[PDB]
Amino acid sequence: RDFNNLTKGLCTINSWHIYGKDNAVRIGEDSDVLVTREPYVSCDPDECRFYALSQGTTIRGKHSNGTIHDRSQYRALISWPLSSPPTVYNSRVECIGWSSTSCHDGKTRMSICISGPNNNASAVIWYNRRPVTEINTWARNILRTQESECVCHNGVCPVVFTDGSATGPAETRIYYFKEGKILKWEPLAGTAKHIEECSCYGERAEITCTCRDNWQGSNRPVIRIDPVAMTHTSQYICSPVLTDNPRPNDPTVGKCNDPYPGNNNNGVKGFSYLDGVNTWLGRTISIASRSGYEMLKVPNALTDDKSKPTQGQTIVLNTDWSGYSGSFMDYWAEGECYRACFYVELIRGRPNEDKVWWTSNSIVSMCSSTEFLGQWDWPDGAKIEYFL
Amino acid sequence: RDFNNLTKGLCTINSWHIYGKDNAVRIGEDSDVLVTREPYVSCDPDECRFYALSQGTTIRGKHSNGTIHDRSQYRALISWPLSSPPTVYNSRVECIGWSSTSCHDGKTRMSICISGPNNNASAVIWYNRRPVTEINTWARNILRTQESECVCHNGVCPVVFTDGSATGPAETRIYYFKEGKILKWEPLAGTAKHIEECSCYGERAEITCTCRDNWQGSNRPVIRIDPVAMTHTSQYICSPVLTDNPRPNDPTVGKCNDPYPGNNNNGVKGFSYLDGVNTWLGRTISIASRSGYEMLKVPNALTDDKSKPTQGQTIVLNTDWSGYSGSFMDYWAEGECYRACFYVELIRGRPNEDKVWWTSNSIVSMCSSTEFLGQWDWPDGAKIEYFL
Amino acid sequence: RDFNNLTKGLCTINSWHIYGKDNAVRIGEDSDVLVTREPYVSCDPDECRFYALSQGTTIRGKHSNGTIHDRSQYRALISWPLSSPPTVYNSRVECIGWSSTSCHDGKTRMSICISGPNNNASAVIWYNRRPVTEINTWARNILRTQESECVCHNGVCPVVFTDGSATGPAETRIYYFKEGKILKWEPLAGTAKHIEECSCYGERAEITCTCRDNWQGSNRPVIRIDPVAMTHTSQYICSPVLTDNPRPNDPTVGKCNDPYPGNNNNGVKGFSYLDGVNTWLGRTISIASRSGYEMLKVPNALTDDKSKPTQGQTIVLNTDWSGYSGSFMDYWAEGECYRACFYVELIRGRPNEDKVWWTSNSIVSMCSSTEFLGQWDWPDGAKIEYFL
Amino acid sequence: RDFNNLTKGLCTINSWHIYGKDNAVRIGEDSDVLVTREPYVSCDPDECRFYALSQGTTIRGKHSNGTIHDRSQYRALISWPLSSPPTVYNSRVECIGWSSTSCHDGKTRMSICISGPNNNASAVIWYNRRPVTEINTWARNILRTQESECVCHNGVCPVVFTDGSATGPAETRIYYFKEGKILKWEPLAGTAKHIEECSCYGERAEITCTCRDNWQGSNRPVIRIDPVAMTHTSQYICSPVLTDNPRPNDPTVGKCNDPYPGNNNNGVKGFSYLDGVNTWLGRTISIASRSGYEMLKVPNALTDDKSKPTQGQTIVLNTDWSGYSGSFMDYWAEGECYRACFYVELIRGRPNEDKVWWTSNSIVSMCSSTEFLGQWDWPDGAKIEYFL
Numbered sequence A, B, C, D: 001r002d003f004n005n006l007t008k009g010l011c012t013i014n015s016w017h018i019y020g021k022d023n024a025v026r027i028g029e030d031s032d033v034l035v036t037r038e039p040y041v042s043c044d045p046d047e048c049r050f051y052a053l054s055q056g057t058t059i060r061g062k063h064s065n066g067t068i069h070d071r072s073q074y075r076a077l078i079s080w081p082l083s084s085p086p087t088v089y090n091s092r093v094e095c096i097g098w099s100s101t102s103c104h105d106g107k108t109r110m111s112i113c114i115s116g117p118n119n120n121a122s123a124v125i126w127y128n129r130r131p132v133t134e135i136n137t138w139a140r141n142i143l144r145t146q147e148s149e150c151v152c153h154n155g156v157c158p159v160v161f162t163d164g165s166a167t168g169p170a171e172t173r174i175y176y177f178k179e180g181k182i183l184k185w186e187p188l189a190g191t192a193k194h195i196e197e198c199s200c201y202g203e204r205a206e207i208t209c210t211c212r213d214n215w216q217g218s219n220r221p222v223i224r225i226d227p228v229a230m231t232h233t234s235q236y237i238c239s240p241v242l243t244d245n246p247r248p249n250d251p252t253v254g255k256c257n258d259p260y261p262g263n264n265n266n267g268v269k270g271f272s273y274l275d276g277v278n279t280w281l282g283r284t285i286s287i288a289s290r291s292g293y294e295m296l297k298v299p300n301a302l303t304d305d306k307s308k309p310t311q312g313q314t315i316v317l318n319t320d321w322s323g324y325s326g327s328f329m330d331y332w333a334e335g336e337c338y339r340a341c342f343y344v345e346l347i348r349g350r351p352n353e354d355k356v357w358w359t360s361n362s363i364v365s366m367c368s369s370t371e372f373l374g375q376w377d378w379p380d381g382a383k384i385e386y387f388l
């Protein structure tokens, strides 16, 4: 009821615990579950919810055939209660569109959806369930944004957007909203070469986004934002623990201000918590495919170009499929520090499990513990063969 | 919590953005979705909802066979959350009946449903979820009303009703309600020859309804209402951009106070925002069939009998089916002016897609932007062949 | 928030309008609708709801075979929103049992359910969602009650119960509860010979119940209750318009203090509003079967043993099935007088439509209008053949 | 809104009445009902709810094959409204895990779920819908807890946990939480030899848990807790009415401080209300199988090693299956004493009804009456043959 302010620092991440899990495609085999992809989690002052881009069909309906494709008039951003499946009957539509981001500012929620053809797309910014601002395509080639939650600090919420090429120079802007209205915007600055899909968090009045260079880097771009001054910088993560996918095998020395060459024109959405000795990177286990997921503690990963892992945790075993991951935190929990959390998307169907005609996913989420807890692995758990 | 007053004027409509979309018949192929028709949208001070006349069946049930017919004992007015499908489990029944209108007055909602045989029909007016007033048929031939939201101004809400012939002179009355009770009623005055289905909005303490002459005019009737004085007038739209369907091809000169001859005994429910230079008309693209939908900016359309389009926007392409459209606005949004919005009904099944035995629809809604946004088209999206 | 008091008299019933309708068995053919019977309606200060005794199955499930039988461990009293079908997902269970009654007292709701074997049954009285009092069988032969709403007056709510024979003398008691606790109880007094299923209402601090003599009368018993004094009397309705079913054809002269002979050992639950010149009786049209339903205005029906109809209204045509009916009113509506209302149960399945193995129903409800409205008939509307 | 305090004593249990019943597997044959097991009931200050460990599937889906197994990544603790079935659409997830307990403290709810492999498991304690404390396995062999509600007294809520062998010495600890944080913990003391599954209640500021010795006793262990002093003791029940299953036939003399030999390495979760002359024990009727359930009044059962039944009540007949039972009470009901209540789990599927591939259950619950009520039996009621 007054605007939230990033007042705390992160607690110390010594291991991760299960927070939420869906079992969406399992239950989906016999329930009216919606086909989704590009999920994320976001919290209000009184509840946290699971979010995704709907495809406008149930998994078992006939229109599910074809949902490998990313953009269409039948997609929407829906939220549903924590750890329940996206069900036709329990979801709330936030806005109509095929790219999105959302964050609550302490007083109410801002949601952003984008739709259009590839060359004549637009964003409309919803604040308190109503449309307030609308932005049009600047470079006329798939205007897109984060695909996970943004963060606010005393009313100002910055969002990162890219319009242009995913295979060479694009035009990225950082927009600063306050109550749904534009306060200012900046073109990208700093040394990062291409930005796609920022996964962001804040603490001690500073905002950190770990994004994806789709053009040429197996190491990830980092944008750091001042929300009072409204300025930013960008860099790449220095460490040789490369975290994008597909990617080359890990080196001995890394790169802070240039892409690491290896794979070109591809990638995945990912994240990291960067906090000096307390730094944890997440990544796929496969260097070739979106298979498995681990978390790795790599001290000073951002600055030390020779930093190697100190500790780890396996979240999905390499035989199972993962997909996109991103960061969130509940800024309204009691306690002295912010607890780090993340989700991982578990994609099922095409392109890897080609004997079905659909593509859907479930979610697993995790948050930090200061204890050293034992680990388990958290796979989707459906058997594709039941859908035949 | 005190009665709402039309205090503002319209913002400037420079283009339209997606507000809501259902994907109802797509999801309906495998979910418990109700068969509807004659939809509309209406807002409360804290939420906006989607509304329709139910048929009392799921699309995929066996009783769906036969729902081409308009009037029966199994129909009802239902509202459900914005952009969700009308589902057996998520809908709220407002009243029992086969014609309806509804509007919130700032303190609570008035809903009106009509039922009966053709010659012995009646309306009962619900205020705050309870029945308060009841009106009986005056001309004993299908007593009907708006099929979209009415509007109030400091407690008084006028509703337009026609009883009689749809193929020659009928008796139309304007009723003025305050808290569900009748304050006054008037027979139709002015030059309009036949009234059916008013689509209404208000601004600066004046109410505008664009209706359908089913008898003999391809140009539309307009009733303008003073809610303080409780009086009205009627006229036709002057412009040669004819907006009813079926209709003759557009002329060079139009008619302000007489019907334009061409098609007789037929039509569709439609709307317009009439605001001097800021005027936009909506219509089907086909002059013969309810196929496609466009919006056209036609300065001074109401008064200038030679007015031609200045700008446009395509909402449904001509290969797809549309059907009824109507106007709404959220009178309780923050900001200096009222934002114009509309819905379009996308009818599927009989009479055009004769290989199925049912008739249902979905909704698409749009609201104004002052920006010049790019366009996309918004078709229903189901494949009839999956229902065979 | 203080106890409700019957302060008003009835308005003048000049005709009846639709209030609610279910279309339950229609929608039930393809939705998860529960098998019910013995329905009724009851209102709170802020909403009115539909109520019934569940069978513990969906209409289309396999356990529906056998639901002709009245008493079992799988039945429960459920309420759901007005004019929606009893759905597995939208119903609220009030208490577990095979006979019930319920009424709100201004502060909260009292619900009573009975279960057991035929000879060792018991009632438990729930007040504010919790169990408070429990009564055991006195005559050890199906302890039963109203099967519709009771009524309260400044906290005291009387309920009528019969334990014993349905084919000769039973023991009927009137119990007076206040906050779920027993204040007093009385054995039946007056001239009525057998009581089953009271359908009750109140006005001007007096309570009227019209019940069913299952032993030997085609004319109905009437109990009148003083809730301040906590006393009652009973009589039969004087008029020759016999309203039970099965029944003999109507006579010329009737009986005030004795049963009218004709049919023995059978009947149906029914009701009447008894208010001098303003008196309306409801009944089946068939004298042999539960088919059709009409309402008949019969001045002074209670006292004049020669009273004949003055006006009428048909609610279900004789070709369709009806079943039980009962009275309710919304005691918390605005206005000077109480509006009379009623429901009728539309039974489908065994014993009359023997080609299916289940028995279920839907509801139609109606309330008074002072206007003279036109009529329509309101049948269930399912086609049994779709269930084969 | 201030912490609850166990201020009252128990009322006198003279017989038991139905409180809630599910009919879950009956309705499950044609509805989207979840596969559960290990149920229990727990109340808040304004409502009571039904709780269970989900399997992540609908009964009728294909992933139900295999749900005989107890631990996996697809299980979760869900609550749903009283006497409704656990439905995919109506359940709320409390936490992710395969062992659990929960209790409300007057201000909000604490929930505890455990997951992991058998040797590297962990608990995370949720308070007010958020994760607060996390405990790791101490003996590295299935860290488990109560499987029913815990109880609080002025903010402090003790929970009992066992880590280790279920077939010889394990390490049991009593933990005392206040607002989700650990205040203190104790290893087991007293004479009980092995603890599994405590079923607990409190009155007059003292907490009583009746548990299961899985190692070697047909008589049950009892832990009594002081929540102000935070200390406990343990004993076995003295009476020869043995209440575990499988068990030997009842003796003449019993044992207070040693296990009664007979069956080794097996058992079931059960409970008792121990209150001097007012003492009631519940048990399976079969000494060999989980079939039937009765309640038996056995004065001073805890202290008198020769105590025999005085009165009884049959809850499930011996031909039907039962399974786990446990205690609850609504500490926020009006009145002078606490009313005793219990649930019984009715297991259907494998291992006893081997012609299906799944294992699920329904619930029946009962609470005390001071009246002497008649009895009925409350079986699950599904027919397995409909699932073939």
Ligand SMILES: *[C@@H]1O[C@H](CO)[C@@H](O[C@@H]2O[C@H](CO)[C@@H](O[C@@H]3O[C@H](CO[C@H]4O[C@H](CO)[C@@H](O)[C@H](O)[C@@H]4O)[C@@H](O)[C@H](O[C@H]4O[C@H](CO)[C@@H](O)[C@H](O)[C@@H]4O[C@H]4O[C@H](CO)[C@@H](O)[C@H](O)[C@@H]4O[C@H]4O[C@H](CO)[C@@H](O)[C@H](O)[C@@H]4O)[C@@H]3O)[C@H](O)[C@H]2NC(C)=O)[C@H](O)[C@H]1NC(C)=O
Residues within 6 Å of the ligand: A240, A241, A248, A249, A250, A285, A286, A287, A294, A295, A296, A308, A309, A310, A311, A312, A313, A372, A373, A374, A375, D119, D120
């Ligand atoms: C009970 O529960 C507890 C809690 O979970 C369990 O304890 C945990 O066990 C985990 C598994 O062993 C363990 O995680 C590992 O931690 C290593 C840290 O160890 C180093 O430091 C510590 C302290 O100094 C020393 O003890 C240790 O000797 C080491 O010095 C990480 O190094 C591990 O990650 C690496 O291995 C895994 C496979 O094990 C890889 O998938 C991962 O990517 C890492 O290795 C690749 O990348 C590095 C960095 O570039 C390369 O050096 C390496 O060669 C690999 O490179 C190839 O592979 C990658 C990916 O395939 C590819 O990109 C690249 O090109 C190459 O092909 C691992 O994270 C936890 O730390 C530990 N937790 C605690 C608190 O103890 C316990 O075991 C459980 N079990 C039981 C039975 O009780």
Ligand SMILES: *[C@@H]1O[C@H](CO)[C@@H](O[C@@H]2O[C@H](CO)[C@@H](O[C@@H]3O[C@H](CO[C@H]4O[C@H](CO)[C@@H](O)[C@H](O)[C@@H]4O)[C@@H](O)[C@H](O[C@H]4O[C@H](CO)[C@@H](O)[C@H](O)[C@@H]4O[C@H]4O[C@H](CO)[C@@H](O)[C@H](O)[C@@H]4O[C@H]4O[C@H](CO)[C@@H](O)[C@H](O)[C@@H]4O)[C@@H]3O)[C@H](O)[C@H]2NC(C)=O)[C@H](O)[C@H]1NC(C)=O
Residues within 6 Å of the ligand: A119, A120, B240, B241, B248, B249, B250, B285, B286, B287, B294, B295, B296, B308, B309, B310, B311, B312, B313, B372, B373, B374, B375
């Ligand atoms: C990216 O996004 C942007 C935003 O959408 C796109 O820009 C928009 O593009 C639209 C499509 O071209 C455009 O809409 C048209 O606007 C015309 C206005 O133009 C006139 O004025 C402007 C300014 O003076 C001039 O630039 C221009 O030269 C003109 O002078 C409208 O006239 C258009 O509508 C008419 O055409 C369509 C088909 O294009 C018809 O369906 C429509 O009904 C109109 O034509 C019929 O009716 C008129 C009036 O009676 C007749 O004159 C005409 O002959 C037609 O009559 C027949 O057809 C009807 C219906 O079938 C029938 O009843 C009758 O009997 C006859 O049979 C059209 O609306 C937007 O204005 C423009 N927006 C902006 C801000 O720029 C951009 O293109 C996108 N694309 C890309 C690739 O980036």
Ligand SMILES: *[C@@H]1O[C@H](CO)[C@@H](O[C@@H]2O[C@H](CO)[C@@H](O[C@@H]3O[C@H](CO[C@H]4O[C@H](CO)[C@@H](O)[C@H](O)[C@@H]4O)[C@@H](O)[C@H](O[C@H]4O[C@H](CO)[C@@H](O)[C@H](O)[C@@H]4O[C@H]4O[C@H](CO)[C@@H](O)[C@H](O)[C@@H]4O[C@H]4O[C@H](CO)[C@@H](O)[C@H](O)[C@@H]4O)[C@@H]3O)[C@H](O)[C@H]2NC(C)=O)[C@H](O)[C@H]1NC(C)=O
Residues within 6 Å of the ligand: B119, B120, C240, C241, C248, C249, C250, C285, C286, C287, C294, C295, C296, C308, C309, C310, C311, C312, C313, C372, C373, C374, C375
């Ligand atoms: C438009 O809408 C309006 C509003 O609905 C319609 O107007 C209404 O029309 C109704 C149908 O005609 C009408 O209802 C009838 O009212 C009669 C009252 O009439 C008497 O008084 C008035 C005023 O004095 C006079 O005008 C009139 O001439 C009469 O004197 C009732 O008598 C009618 O009920 C009886 O008839 C029906 C069939 O019509 C029976 O089912 C019913 O049970 C009644 O008859 C049986 O019972 C009586 C009493 O014992 C016996 O006398 C009689 O012989 C029958 O007995 C047999 O049948 C029963 C049941 O089967 C059985 O038990 C027994 O043993 C015997 O076998 C009827 O109710 C409304 O009053 C009228 N409303 C108004 C405000 O005008 C209008 O028509 C609509 N239509 C159009 C086309 O516009």
Ligand SMILES: *[C@@H]1O[C@H](CO)[C@@H](O[C@@H]2O[C@H](CO)[C@@H](O[C@@H]3O[C@H](CO[C@H]4O[C@H](CO)[C@@H](O)[C@H](O)[C@@H]4O)[C@@H](O)[C@H](O[C@H]4O[C@H](CO)[C@@H](O)[C@H](O)[C@@H]4O[C@H]4O[C@H](CO)[C@@H](O)[C@H](O)[C@@H]4O[C@H]4O[C@H](CO)[C@@H](O)[C@H](O)[C@@H]4O)[C@@H]3O)[C@H](O)[C@H]2NC(C)=O)[C@H](O)[C@H]1NC(C)=O
Residues within 6 Å of the ligand: C119, C120, D240, D241, D248, D249, D250, D285, D286, D287, D294, D295, D296, D308, D309, D310, D311, D312, D313, D372, D373, D374, D375
């Ligand atoms: C209407 O409703 C009312 C209310 O329900 C009904 O009234 C109730 O009826 C119940 C059934 O008869 C009755 O319950 C029984 O109560 C006995 C208490 O009786 C003793 O005390 C009273 C007062 O002094 C005397 O009247 C009476 O004569 C006795 O002295 C219990 O003893 C009964 O339980 C035992 O029997 C059942 C079968 O009936 C067993 O299943 C149960 O486990 C008990 O017996 C076993 O265990 C004991 C203890 O060790 C052994 O002594 C015994 O030999 C059995 O041992 C074998 O079996 C067990 C389990 O199989 C196994 O472990 C062991 O190894 C051995 O193999 C029973 O509980 C209610 O008390 C009564 N209520 C009231 C208020 O009256 C009325 O009937 C209804 N019906 C009608 C038609 O109106």
Ligand SMILES: *[C@@H]1O[C@H](CO)[C@@H](O)[C@H](O)[C@H]1NC(C)=O
Residues within 6 Å of the ligand: A002, A003, A004, A005, A106, A154
């Ligand atoms: C955030 O900071 C502003 C001052 O910068 C203050 O007014 C506001 O109330 C703060 N947030 C909260 C929750 O107090």
Ligand SMILES: *[C@@H]1O[C@H](CO)[C@@H](O)[C@H](O)[C@H]1NC(C)=O
Residues within 6 Å of the ligand: A065, A066, A357
């Ligand atoms: C999906 O669609 C393609 C063509 O659009 C068709 O070949 C394929 O068989 C479809 N899948 C199914 C299961 O029908």
Ligand SMILES: *[C@@H]1O[C@H](CO)[C@@H](O)[C@H](O)[C@H]1NC(C)=O
Residues within 6 Å of the ligand: B002, B003, B004, B005, B106, B154
């Ligand atoms: C509408 O106008 C009346 C006076 O005409 C005023 O009392 C009322 O409060 C106004 N509405 C609002 C929301 O203030």
Ligand SMILES: *[C@@H]1O[C@H](CO)[C@@H](O)[C@H](O)[C@H]1NC(C)=O
Residues within 6 Å of the ligand: B065, B066, B357
């Ligand atoms: C619809 O009903 C008609 C007759 O009422 C019948 O010919 C037709 O086949 C029905 N449709 C279906 C799919 O049964």
Ligand SMILES: *[C@@H]1O[C@H](CO)[C@@H](O)[C@H](O)[C@H]1NC(C)=O
Residues within 6 Å of the ligand: C002, C003, C004, C005, C106, C154
């Ligand atoms: C009902 O009557 C009592 C006095 O008899 C009064 O206290 C109570 O408040 C009355 N009900 C209402 C709603 O005022």
Ligand SMILES: *[C@@H]1O[C@H](CO)[C@@H](O)[C@H](O)[C@H]1NC(C)=O
Residues within 6 Å of the ligand: C065, C066, C357
């Ligand atoms: C209902 O049950 C009876 C025997 O209990 C059986 O004959 C009948 O066929 C059943 N109905 C159906 C449709 O199975």
Ligand SMILES: *[C@@H]1O[C@H](CO)[C@@H](O)[C@H](O)[C@H]1NC(C)=O
Residues within 6 Å of the ligand: D002, D003, D004, D005, D106, D154
């Ligand atoms: C419980 O006891 C404490 C004092 O021991 C008191 O503060 C608290 O308010 C009590 N609970 C209630 C509901 O009053």
Ligand SMILES: *[C@@H]1O[C@H](CO)[C@@H](O)[C@H](O)[C@H]1NC(C)=O
Residues within 6 Å of the ligand: D065, D066, D357
């Ligand atoms: C369950 O799974 C086993 C093997 O995992 C298989 O033999 C069995 O037939 C399955 N049950 C069904 C009904 O498919």
Ligand SMILES: [Ca+2]
Residues within 6 Å of the ligand: A212, A213, A214, A215, A216, A217, A218, A244, A245, A263, A265, A266, A267, A268
């Ligand atoms: Ca890349």
Ligand SMILES: [Ca+2]
Residues within 6 Å of the ligand: B212, B213, B214, B215, B216, B217, B218, B244, B245, B263, B265, B266, B267, B268
């Ligand atoms: Ca026309």
Ligand SMILES: [Ca+2]
Residues within 6 Å of the ligand: C212, C213, C214, C215, C216, C217, C218, C244, C245, C263, C265, C266, C267, C268
């Ligand atoms: Ca009778």
Ligand SMILES: [Ca+2]
Residues within 6 Å of the ligand: D212, D213, D214, D215, D216, D217, D218, D244, D245, D263, D265, D266, D267, D268
């Ligand atoms: Ca044992």
